[PDB]
Amino acid sequence: AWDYDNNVIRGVNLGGWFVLEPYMTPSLFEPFQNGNDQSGVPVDEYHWTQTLGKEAALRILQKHWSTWITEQDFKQISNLGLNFVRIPIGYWAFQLLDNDPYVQGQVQYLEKALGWARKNNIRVWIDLHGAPGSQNGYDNSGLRDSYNFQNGDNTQVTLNVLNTIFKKYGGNEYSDVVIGIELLNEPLGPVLNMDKLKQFFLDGYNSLRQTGSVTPVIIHDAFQVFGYWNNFLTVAEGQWNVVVDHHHYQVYSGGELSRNINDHISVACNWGWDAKKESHWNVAGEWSAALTDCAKWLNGVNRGARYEGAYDNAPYIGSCQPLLDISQWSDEHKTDTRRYIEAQLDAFEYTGGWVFWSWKTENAPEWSFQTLTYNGLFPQPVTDRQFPNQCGFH
């Protein structure tokens, strides 16, 4: 169904759908605010379902699931020249821990989506985005500020959920649609035991192949240096059909944010230079147009922006309010944005391709493919260039 040699991925993530993210759908969380006091807002899906209780959480989520992304979205993705989507899903869609507050029903909508992708000639990765106890302490794992994926039986539970995914979506039924299963989104390598994480990736590889699946195994880079994975899961050891997923951003520290526009572009070009040198096939599974961390609740519910020196001991660089709404952007910021998107596109097509985070948001424009396209900032067709050859690839 795919050729990671000769084809190029041109995709979007379906984010904020089966795993709630406050900055993407703030309407689901804001109602819990009293005046300007944010302290009573649930910080993640785990606490959001917990406050609501099972029956009310299911009523509200059924409404969200049935409207957030639909068949018409897949038709529009196809019409815009895209060939691919990445679909995040939490472990809790499949299996619950004894005391978990989460509700199920996502699986019905995933299977509808695999049908909508087939109908529109779209390929798919299925991505396990949250594991029990949390692999990273981010709100996008379901459970913020906890790091217990490697504690007790959380790893074994994660493997059991993956085996389910392998059997239902990695076999003959979906082999014309699914061109990857990603074992785990963004395990936080710096805080985890890396020998144990490598054994987990190896167990998932062997257990997928064991069911008779020929589906590519997708491994996230775990925030390690370029080349760190070069001797892991290699053809020289009979390990085949493996892709490394890199996520590329410039907004999550004071130093990256401080860069001028030319420097942001030099960094983007260099991503592509260095990926070309790697031994594994590789794809930029996440990236965006963001030059700030200004979108409301981007770093979490009740946390400010590094860009205005209001998070993570970053110093002040610039003020967020005039950048919240794209109608209010200056000509300079529009131009900077167009340049940055085109440089990234050129860098990512130098190897396996690219998957923009994300298709849509309620009103975070730096993070919405639809909003950027409609405003003339994301190329359409995706090959169009107002600033051709910023990188000079050989």
Side-chain angles (χ1 to χ4, degrees), residues 2-3 22 53 72 117 130 137 141 149 191 198 200 230 238 246 252 273 280 342-343 375 377:
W2 207 246
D3 181 350
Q72 163 74 16
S141 78
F149 162 61
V191 310
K198 285 175 190 183
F200 165 78
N230 280 350
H246 299 301
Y252 291 125
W273 287 119
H280 290 286
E342 293 189 9
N375 284 276
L377 306 188

mmCIF file with all atom_site columns, all heavy atoms in Angstrom, residues 2-3 22 53 72 117 130 137 141 149 191 198 200 230 238 246 252 273 280 342-343 375 377:
data_model
loop_
_atom_site.group_PDB
_atom_site.id
_atom_site.type_symbol
_atom_site.label_atom_id
_atom_site.label_alt_id
_atom_site.label_comp_id
_atom_site.label_asym_id
_atom_site.label_entity_id
_atom_site.label_seq_id
_atom_site.pdbx_PDB_ins_code
_atom_site.Cartn_x
_atom_site.Cartn_y
_atom_site.Cartn_z
_atom_site.occupancy
_atom_site.B_iso_or_equiv
_atom_site.pdbx_formal_charge
_atom_site.auth_seq_id
_atom_site.auth_comp_id
_atom_site.auth_asym_id
_atom_site.auth_atom_id
_atom_site.pdbx_PDB_model_num
ATOM 1   N N   . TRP A 1 2   ? 2.125   1.208  0.414  1.00 0.00 ? 2   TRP A N   1
ATOM 2   C CA  . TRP A 1 2   ? 3.140   2.348  0.403  1.00 0.00 ? 2   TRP A CA  1
ATOM 3   C C   . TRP A 1 2   ? 4.615   2.063  0.026  1.00 0.00 ? 2   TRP A C   1
ATOM 4   O O   . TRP A 1 2   ? 5.102   0.980  0.284  1.00 0.00 ? 2   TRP A O   1
ATOM 5   C CB  . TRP A 1 2   ? 3.189   3.062  1.762  1.00 0.00 ? 2   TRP A CB  1
ATOM 6   C CG  . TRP A 1 2   ? 3.621   4.497  1.662  1.00 0.00 ? 2   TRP A CG  1
ATOM 7   C CD1 . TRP A 1 2   ? 4.771   5.043  2.154  1.00 0.00 ? 2   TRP A CD1 1
ATOM 8   C CD2 . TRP A 1 2   ? 2.913   5.568  1.009  1.00 0.00 ? 2   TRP A CD2 1
ATOM 9   N NE1 . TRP A 1 2   ? 4.817   6.404  1.874  1.00 0.00 ? 2   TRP A NE1 1
ATOM 10  C CE2 . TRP A 1 2   ? 3.692   6.749  1.172  1.00 0.00 ? 2   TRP A CE2 1
ATOM 11  C CE3 . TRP A 1 2   ? 1.697   5.650  0.306  1.00 0.00 ? 2   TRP A CE3 1
ATOM 12  C CZ2 . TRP A 1 2   ? 3.290   7.993  0.659  1.00 0.00 ? 2   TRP A CZ2 1
ATOM 13  C CZ3 . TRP A 1 2   ? 1.289   6.889  -0.191 1.00 0.00 ? 2   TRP A CZ3 1
ATOM 14  C CH2 . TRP A 1 2   ? 2.090   8.044  -0.018 1.00 0.00 ? 2   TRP A CH2 1
ATOM 15  N N   . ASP A 1 3   ? 5.313   3.083  -0.505 1.00 0.00 ? 3   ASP A N   1
ATOM 16  C CA  . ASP A 1 3   ? 6.762   3.056  -0.858 1.00 0.00 ? 3   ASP A CA  1
ATOM 17  C C   . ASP A 1 3   ? 7.540   4.216  -0.166 1.00 0.00 ? 3   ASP A C   1
ATOM 18  O O   . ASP A 1 3   ? 7.620   5.337  -0.691 1.00 0.00 ? 3   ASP A O   1
ATOM 19  C CB  . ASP A 1 3   ? 6.887   3.141  -2.410 1.00 0.00 ? 3   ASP A CB  1
ATOM 20  C CG  . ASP A 1 3   ? 8.336   3.098  -2.933 1.00 0.00 ? 3   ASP A CG  1
ATOM 21  O OD1 . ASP A 1 3   ? 9.311   3.182  -2.149 1.00 0.00 ? 3   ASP A OD1 1
ATOM 22  O OD2 . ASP A 1 3   ? 8.490   2.991  -4.186 1.00 0.00 ? 3   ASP A OD2 1
ATOM 23  N N   . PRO A 1 22  ? -6.739  20.681 25.941 1.00 0.00 ? 22  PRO A N   1
ATOM 24  C CA  . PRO A 1 22  ? -7.399  21.962 26.274 1.00 0.00 ? 22  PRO A CA  1
ATOM 25  C C   . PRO A 1 22  ? -7.181  23.103 25.276 1.00 0.00 ? 22  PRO A C   1
ATOM 26  O O   . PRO A 1 22  ? -8.142  23.816 24.995 1.00 0.00 ? 22  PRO A O   1
ATOM 27  C CB  . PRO A 1 22  ? -6.858  22.276 27.668 1.00 0.00 ? 22  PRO A CB  1
ATOM 28  C CG  . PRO A 1 22  ? -6.788  20.886 28.290 1.00 0.00 ? 22  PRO A CG  1
ATOM 29  C CD  . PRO A 1 22  ? -6.224  20.016 27.159 1.00 0.00 ? 22  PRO A CD  1
ATOM 30  N N   . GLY A 1 53  ? -18.319 12.619 35.708 1.00 0.00 ? 53  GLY A N   1
ATOM 31  C CA  . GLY A 1 53  ? -18.931 11.300 35.916 1.00 0.00 ? 53  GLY A CA  1
ATOM 32  C C   . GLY A 1 53  ? -19.178 10.634 34.582 1.00 0.00 ? 53  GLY A C   1
ATOM 33  O O   . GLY A 1 53  ? -19.196 11.327 33.528 1.00 0.00 ? 53  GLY A O   1
ATOM 34  N N   . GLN A 1 72  ? -16.822 14.382 5.678  1.00 0.00 ? 72  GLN A N   1
ATOM 35  C CA  . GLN A 1 72  ? -16.599 15.598 4.876  1.00 0.00 ? 72  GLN A CA  1
ATOM 36  C C   . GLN A 1 72  ? -15.169 16.157 5.111  1.00 0.00 ? 72  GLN A C   1
ATOM 37  O O   . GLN A 1 72  ? -14.535 16.675 4.166  1.00 0.00 ? 72  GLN A O   1
ATOM 38  C CB  . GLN A 1 72  ? -17.716 16.642 5.149  1.00 0.00 ? 72  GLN A CB  1
ATOM 39  C CG  . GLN A 1 72  ? -17.434 18.083 4.722  1.00 0.00 ? 72  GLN A CG  1
ATOM 40  C CD  . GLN A 1 72  ? -17.508 18.280 3.211  1.00 0.00 ? 72  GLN A CD  1
ATOM 41  O OE1 . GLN A 1 72  ? -18.056 17.437 2.471  1.00 0.00 ? 72  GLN A OE1 1
ATOM 42  N NE2 . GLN A 1 72  ? -16.970 19.398 2.745  1.00 0.00 ? 72  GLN A NE2 1
ATOM 43  N N   . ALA A 1 117 ? -11.225 6.999  4.946  1.00 0.00 ? 117 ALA A N   1
ATOM 44  C CA  . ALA A 1 117 ? -9.871  7.081  4.327  1.00 0.00 ? 117 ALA A CA  1
ATOM 45  C C   . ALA A 1 117 ? -9.841  6.220  3.043  1.00 0.00 ? 117 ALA A C   1
ATOM 46  O O   . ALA A 1 117 ? -9.423  6.695  1.974  1.00 0.00 ? 117 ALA A O   1
ATOM 47  C CB  . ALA A 1 117 ? -8.743  6.667  5.332  1.00 0.00 ? 117 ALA A CB  1
ATOM 48  N N   . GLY A 1 130 ? -1.355  7.811  24.290 1.00 0.00 ? 130 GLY A N   1
ATOM 49  C CA  . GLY A 1 130 ? -1.308  7.804  25.774 1.00 0.00 ? 130 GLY A CA  1
ATOM 50  C C   . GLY A 1 130 ? -1.269  6.366  26.330 1.00 0.00 ? 130 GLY A C   1
ATOM 51  O O   . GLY A 1 130 ? -2.052  5.489  25.895 1.00 0.00 ? 130 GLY A O   1
ATOM 52  N N   . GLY A 1 137 ? 4.102   12.746 31.169 1.00 0.00 ? 137 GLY A N   1
ATOM 53  C CA  . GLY A 1 137 ? 3.501   13.834 31.972 1.00 0.00 ? 137 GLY A CA  1
ATOM 54  C C   . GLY A 1 137 ? 2.901   15.005 31.198 1.00 0.00 ? 137 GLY A C   1
ATOM 55  O O   . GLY A 1 137 ? 2.596   16.058 31.794 1.00 0.00 ? 137 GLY A O   1
ATOM 56  N N   . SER A 1 141 ? -1.109  13.052 26.815 1.00 0.00 ? 141 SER A N   1
ATOM 57  C CA  . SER A 1 141 ? -1.050  11.586 27.195 1.00 0.00 ? 141 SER A CA  1
ATOM 58  C C   . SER A 1 141 ? -2.334  11.106 27.919 1.00 0.00 ? 141 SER A C   1
ATOM 59  O O   . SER A 1 141 ? -2.549  9.876  28.127 1.00 0.00 ? 141 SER A O   1
ATOM 60  C CB  . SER A 1 141 ? 0.190   11.283 28.077 1.00 0.00 ? 141 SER A CB  1
ATOM 61  O OG  . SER A 1 141 ? 0.012   11.698 29.443 1.00 0.00 ? 141 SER A OG  1
ATOM 62  N N   . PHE A 1 149 ? 4.751   5.151  33.348 1.00 0.00 ? 149 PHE A N   1
ATOM 63  C CA  . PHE A 1 149 ? 4.693   4.109  32.275 1.00 0.00 ? 149 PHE A CA  1
ATOM 64  C C   . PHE A 1 149 ? 5.594   2.912  32.582 1.00 0.00 ? 149 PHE A C   1
ATOM 65  O O   . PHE A 1 149 ? 5.228   1.767  32.303 1.00 0.00 ? 149 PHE A O   1
ATOM 66  C CB  . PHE A 1 149 ? 5.036   4.764  30.916 1.00 0.00 ? 149 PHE A CB  1
ATOM 67  C CG  . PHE A 1 149 ? 5.441   3.809  29.815 1.00 0.00 ? 149 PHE A CG  1
ATOM 68  C CD1 . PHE A 1 149 ? 4.573   2.823  29.344 1.00 0.00 ? 149 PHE A CD1 1
ATOM 69  C CD2 . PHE A 1 149 ? 6.660   3.970  29.167 1.00 0.00 ? 149 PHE A CD2 1
ATOM 70  C CE1 . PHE A 1 149 ? 4.951   1.991  28.279 1.00 0.00 ? 149 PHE A CE1 1
ATOM 71  C CE2 . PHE A 1 149 ? 7.037   3.130  28.093 1.00 0.00 ? 149 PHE A CE2 1
ATOM 72  C CZ  . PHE A 1 149 ? 6.177   2.148  27.664 1.00 0.00 ? 149 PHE A CZ  1
ATOM 73  N N   . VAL A 1 191 ? 13.779  11.385 31.123 1.00 0.00 ? 191 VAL A N   1
ATOM 74  C CA  . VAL A 1 191 ? 13.388  10.890 32.449 1.00 0.00 ? 191 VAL A CA  1
ATOM 75  C C   . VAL A 1 191 ? 13.206  9.360  32.548 1.00 0.00 ? 191 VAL A C   1
ATOM 76  O O   . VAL A 1 191 ? 12.983  8.864  33.624 1.00 0.00 ? 191 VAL A O   1
ATOM 77  C CB  . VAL A 1 191 ? 12.105  11.595 33.034 1.00 0.00 ? 191 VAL A CB  1
ATOM 78  C CG1 . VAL A 1 191 ? 12.223  13.124 32.957 1.00 0.00 ? 191 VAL A CG1 1
ATOM 79  C CG2 . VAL A 1 191 ? 10.812  11.070 32.381 1.00 0.00 ? 191 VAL A CG2 1
ATOM 80  N N   . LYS A 1 198 ? 13.930  0.645  24.954 1.00 0.00 ? 198 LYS A N   1
ATOM 81  C CA  . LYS A 1 198 ? 14.366  -0.200 23.819 1.00 0.00 ? 198 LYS A CA  1
ATOM 82  C C   . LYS A 1 198 ? 13.813  -1.630 23.819 1.00 0.00 ? 198 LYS A C   1
ATOM 83  O O   . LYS A 1 198 ? 13.429  -2.103 22.756 1.00 0.00 ? 198 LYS A O   1
ATOM 84  C CB  . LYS A 1 198 ? 15.875  -0.268 23.688 1.00 0.00 ? 198 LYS A CB  1
ATOM 85  C CG  . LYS A 1 198 ? 16.538  0.963  23.114 1.00 0.00 ? 198 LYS A CG  1
ATOM 86  C CD  . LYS A 1 198 ? 18.048  0.719  23.190 1.00 0.00 ? 198 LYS A CD  1
ATOM 87  C CE  . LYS A 1 198 ? 18.841  1.962  22.867 1.00 0.00 ? 198 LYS A CE  1
ATOM 88  N NZ  . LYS A 1 198 ? 20.291  1.669  22.881 1.00 0.00 ? 198 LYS A NZ  1
ATOM 89  N N   . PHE A 1 200 ? 10.927  -2.647 25.297 1.00 0.00 ? 200 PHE A N   1
ATOM 90  C CA  . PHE A 1 200 ? 9.523   -2.395 24.941 1.00 0.00 ? 200 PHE A CA  1
ATOM 91  C C   . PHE A 1 200 ? 9.348   -2.232 23.421 1.00 0.00 ? 200 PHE A C   1
ATOM 92  O O   . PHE A 1 200 ? 8.497   -2.895 22.844 1.00 0.00 ? 200 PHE A O   1
ATOM 93  C CB  . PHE A 1 200 ? 8.998   -1.174 25.729 1.00 0.00 ? 200 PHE A CB  1
ATOM 94  C CG  . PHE A 1 200 ? 7.716   -0.592 25.199 1.00 0.00 ? 200 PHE A CG  1
ATOM 95  C CD1 . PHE A 1 200 ? 6.489   -1.198 25.455 1.00 0.00 ? 200 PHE A CD1 1
ATOM 96  C CD2 . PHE A 1 200 ? 7.743   0.562  24.418 1.00 0.00 ? 200 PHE A CD2 1
ATOM 97  C CE1 . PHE A 1 200 ? 5.300   -0.651 24.970 1.00 0.00 ? 200 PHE A CE1 1
ATOM 98  C CE2 . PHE A 1 200 ? 6.557   1.123  23.918 1.00 0.00 ? 200 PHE A CE2 1
ATOM 99  C CZ  . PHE A 1 200 ? 5.349   0.517  24.186 1.00 0.00 ? 200 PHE A CZ  1
ATOM 100 N N   . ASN A 1 230 ? 20.192  4.489  14.872 1.00 0.00 ? 230 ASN A N   1
ATOM 101 C CA  . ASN A 1 230 ? 20.780  3.922  13.646 1.00 0.00 ? 230 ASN A CA  1
ATOM 102 C C   . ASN A 1 230 ? 21.101  2.406  13.738 1.00 0.00 ? 230 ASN A C   1
ATOM 103 O O   . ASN A 1 230 ? 20.913  1.695  12.766 1.00 0.00 ? 230 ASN A O   1
ATOM 104 C CB  . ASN A 1 230 ? 22.001  4.725  13.174 1.00 0.00 ? 230 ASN A CB  1
ATOM 105 C CG  . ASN A 1 230 ? 21.640  6.040  12.380 1.00 0.00 ? 230 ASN A CG  1
ATOM 106 O OD1 . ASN A 1 230 ? 20.487  6.314  11.986 1.00 0.00 ? 230 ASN A OD1 1
ATOM 107 N ND2 . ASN A 1 230 ? 22.674  6.857  12.159 1.00 0.00 ? 230 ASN A ND2 1
ATOM 108 N N   . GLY A 1 238 ? 17.645  -8.851 10.429 1.00 0.00 ? 238 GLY A N   1
ATOM 109 C CA  . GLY A 1 238 ? 16.335  -9.394 10.044 1.00 0.00 ? 238 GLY A CA  1
ATOM 110 C C   . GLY A 1 238 ? 15.133  -8.613 10.584 1.00 0.00 ? 238 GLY A C   1
ATOM 111 O O   . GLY A 1 238 ? 14.048  -9.178 10.719 1.00 0.00 ? 238 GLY A O   1
ATOM 112 N N   . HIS A 1 246 ? 10.106  11.686 13.717 1.00 0.00 ? 246 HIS A N   1
ATOM 113 C CA  . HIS A 1 246 ? 10.652  12.918 14.323 1.00 0.00 ? 246 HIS A CA  1
ATOM 114 C C   . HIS A 1 246 ? 9.578   14.020 14.447 1.00 0.00 ? 246 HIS A C   1
ATOM 115 O O   . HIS A 1 246 ? 8.783   14.227 13.521 1.00 0.00 ? 246 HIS A O   1
ATOM 116 C CB  . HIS A 1 246 ? 11.823  13.479 13.473 1.00 0.00 ? 246 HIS A CB  1
ATOM 117 C CG  . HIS A 1 246 ? 13.001  12.559 13.318 1.00 0.00 ? 246 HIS A CG  1
ATOM 118 N ND1 . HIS A 1 246 ? 13.728  12.071 14.390 1.00 0.00 ? 246 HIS A ND1 1
ATOM 119 C CD2 . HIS A 1 246 ? 13.610  12.077 12.203 1.00 0.00 ? 246 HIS A CD2 1
ATOM 120 C CE1 . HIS A 1 246 ? 14.723  11.314 13.944 1.00 0.00 ? 246 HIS A CE1 1
ATOM 121 N NE2 . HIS A 1 246 ? 14.683  11.314 12.617 1.00 0.00 ? 246 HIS A NE2 1
ATOM 122 N N   . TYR A 1 252 ? 9.522   25.733 22.335 1.00 0.00 ? 252 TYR A N   1
ATOM 123 C CA  . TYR A 1 252 ? 9.419   25.129 23.658 1.00 0.00 ? 252 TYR A CA  1
ATOM 124 C C   . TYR A 1 252 ? 10.608  25.363 24.591 1.00 0.00 ? 252 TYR A C   1
ATOM 125 O O   . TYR A 1 252 ? 10.810  24.616 25.567 1.00 0.00 ? 252 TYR A O   1
ATOM 126 C CB  . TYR A 1 252 ? 9.047   23.637 23.548 1.00 0.00 ? 252 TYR A CB  1
ATOM 127 C CG  . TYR A 1 252 ? 7.637   23.433 23.042 1.00 0.00 ? 252 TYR A CG  1
ATOM 128 C CD1 . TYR A 1 252 ? 7.394   22.635 21.923 1.00 0.00 ? 252 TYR A CD1 1
ATOM 129 C CD2 . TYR A 1 252 ? 6.535   24.013 23.697 1.00 0.00 ? 252 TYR A CD2 1
ATOM 130 C CE1 . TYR A 1 252 ? 6.116   22.436 21.450 1.00 0.00 ? 252 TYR A CE1 1
ATOM 131 C CE2 . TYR A 1 252 ? 5.234   23.806 23.220 1.00 0.00 ? 252 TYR A CE2 1
ATOM 132 C CZ  . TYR A 1 252 ? 5.043   23.016 22.102 1.00 0.00 ? 252 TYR A CZ  1
ATOM 133 O OH  . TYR A 1 252 ? 3.784   22.783 21.613 1.00 0.00 ? 252 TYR A OH  1
ATOM 134 N N   . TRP A 1 273 ? 18.801  18.494 6.217  1.00 0.00 ? 273 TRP A N   1
ATOM 135 C CA  . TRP A 1 273 ? 20.198  18.056 6.030  1.00 0.00 ? 273 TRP A CA  1
ATOM 136 C C   . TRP A 1 273 ? 20.547  16.849 6.922  1.00 0.00 ? 273 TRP A C   1
ATOM 137 O O   . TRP A 1 273 ? 21.062  15.833 6.434  1.00 0.00 ? 273 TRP A O   1
ATOM 138 C CB  . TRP A 1 273 ? 21.204  19.215 6.286  1.00 0.00 ? 273 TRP A CB  1
ATOM 139 C CG  . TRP A 1 273 ? 21.260  20.288 5.211  1.00 0.00 ? 273 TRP A CG  1
ATOM 140 C CD1 . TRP A 1 273 ? 20.975  21.647 5.363  1.00 0.00 ? 273 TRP A CD1 1
ATOM 141 C CD2 . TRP A 1 273 ? 21.646  20.114 3.833  1.00 0.00 ? 273 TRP A CD2 1
ATOM 142 N NE1 . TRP A 1 273 ? 21.148  22.307 4.146  1.00 0.00 ? 273 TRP A NE1 1
ATOM 143 C CE2 . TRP A 1 273 ? 21.550  21.403 3.197  1.00 0.00 ? 273 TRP A CE2 1
ATOM 144 C CE3 . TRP A 1 273 ? 22.049  19.000 3.064  1.00 0.00 ? 273 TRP A CE3 1
ATOM 145 C CZ2 . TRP A 1 273 ? 21.867  21.600 1.833  1.00 0.00 ? 273 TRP A CZ2 1
ATOM 146 C CZ3 . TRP A 1 273 ? 22.352  19.190 1.707  1.00 0.00 ? 273 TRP A CZ3 1
ATOM 147 C CH2 . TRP A 1 273 ? 22.269  20.494 1.109  1.00 0.00 ? 273 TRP A CH2 1
ATOM 148 N N   . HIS A 1 280 ? 17.679  4.929  9.070  1.00 0.00 ? 280 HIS A N   1
ATOM 149 C CA  . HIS A 1 280 ? 16.262  4.558  8.908  1.00 0.00 ? 280 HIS A CA  1
ATOM 150 C C   . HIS A 1 280 ? 15.491  5.509  7.994  1.00 0.00 ? 280 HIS A C   1
ATOM 151 O O   . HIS A 1 280 ? 15.814  6.700  7.916  1.00 0.00 ? 280 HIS A O   1
ATOM 152 C CB  . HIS A 1 280 ? 15.543  4.511  10.281 1.00 0.00 ? 280 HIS A CB  1
ATOM 153 C CG  . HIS A 1 280 ? 15.967  3.363  11.165 1.00 0.00 ? 280 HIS A CG  1
ATOM 154 N ND1 . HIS A 1 280 ? 15.571  2.058  10.940 1.00 0.00 ? 280 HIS A ND1 1
ATOM 155 C CD2 . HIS A 1 280 ? 16.697  3.334  12.306 1.00 0.00 ? 280 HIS A CD2 1
ATOM 156 C CE1 . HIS A 1 280 ? 16.065  1.271  11.885 1.00 0.00 ? 280 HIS A CE1 1
ATOM 157 N NE2 . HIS A 1 280 ? 16.751  2.023  12.728 1.00 0.00 ? 280 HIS A NE2 1
ATOM 158 N N   . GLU A 1 342 ? 7.124   27.280 4.209  1.00 0.00 ? 342 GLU A N   1
ATOM 159 C CA  . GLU A 1 342 ? 7.772   26.811 2.973  1.00 0.00 ? 342 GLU A CA  1
ATOM 160 C C   . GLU A 1 342 ? 9.144   26.178 3.217  1.00 0.00 ? 342 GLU A C   1
ATOM 161 O O   . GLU A 1 342 ? 9.458   25.153 2.612  1.00 0.00 ? 342 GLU A O   1
ATOM 162 C CB  . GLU A 1 342 ? 7.861   27.938 1.926  1.00 0.00 ? 342 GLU A CB  1
ATOM 163 C CG  . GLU A 1 342 ? 6.497   28.374 1.398  1.00 0.00 ? 342 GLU A CG  1
ATOM 164 C CD  . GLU A 1 342 ? 6.575   29.342 0.197  1.00 0.00 ? 342 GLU A CD  1
ATOM 165 O OE1 . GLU A 1 342 ? 7.686   29.551 -0.335 1.00 0.00 ? 342 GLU A OE1 1
ATOM 166 O OE2 . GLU A 1 342 ? 5.525   29.910 -0.198 1.00 0.00 ? 342 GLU A OE2 1
ATOM 167 N N   . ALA A 1 343 ? 9.942   26.765 4.126  1.00 0.00 ? 343 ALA A N   1
ATOM 168 C CA  . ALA A 1 343 ? 11.271  26.188 4.452  1.00 0.00 ? 343 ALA A CA  1
ATOM 169 C C   . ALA A 1 343 ? 11.144  24.792 5.053  1.00 0.00 ? 343 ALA A C   1
ATOM 170 O O   . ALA A 1 343 ? 11.922  23.893 4.699  1.00 0.00 ? 343 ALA A O   1
ATOM 171 C CB  . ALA A 1 343 ? 12.092  27.121 5.427  1.00 0.00 ? 343 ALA A CB  1
ATOM 172 N N   . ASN A 1 375 ? -6.374  31.586 4.966  1.00 0.00 ? 375 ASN A N   1
ATOM 173 C CA  . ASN A 1 375 ? -5.702  32.880 5.060  1.00 0.00 ? 375 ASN A CA  1
ATOM 174 C C   . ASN A 1 375 ? -4.495  33.090 4.117  1.00 0.00 ? 375 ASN A C   1
ATOM 175 O O   . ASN A 1 375 ? -3.837  34.118 4.185  1.00 0.00 ? 375 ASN A O   1
ATOM 176 C CB  . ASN A 1 375 ? -5.316  33.167 6.519  1.00 0.00 ? 375 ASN A CB  1
ATOM 177 C CG  . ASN A 1 375 ? -6.500  33.583 7.370  1.00 0.00 ? 375 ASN A CG  1
ATOM 178 O OD1 . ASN A 1 375 ? -6.855  34.743 7.384  1.00 0.00 ? 375 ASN A OD1 1
ATOM 179 N ND2 . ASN A 1 375 ? -7.109  32.647 8.082  1.00 0.00 ? 375 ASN A ND2 1
ATOM 180 N N   . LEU A 1 377 ? -1.646  31.599 3.981  1.00 0.00 ? 377 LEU A N   1
ATOM 181 C CA  . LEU A 1 377 ? -0.323  31.386 4.597  1.00 0.00 ? 377 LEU A CA  1
ATOM 182 C C   . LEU A 1 377 ? 0.269   29.985 4.389  1.00 0.00 ? 377 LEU A C   1
ATOM 183 O O   . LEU A 1 377 ? 1.495   29.820 4.384  1.00 0.00 ? 377 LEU A O   1
ATOM 184 C CB  . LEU A 1 377 ? -0.372  31.751 6.084  1.00 0.00 ? 377 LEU A CB  1
ATOM 185 C CG  . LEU A 1 377 ? -0.892  33.171 6.410  1.00 0.00 ? 377 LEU A CG  1
ATOM 186 C CD1 . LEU A 1 377 ? -0.663  33.414 7.903  1.00 0.00 ? 377 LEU A CD1 1
ATOM 187 C CD2 . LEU A 1 377 ? -0.227  34.286 5.564  1.00 0.00 ? 377 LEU A CD2 1
#
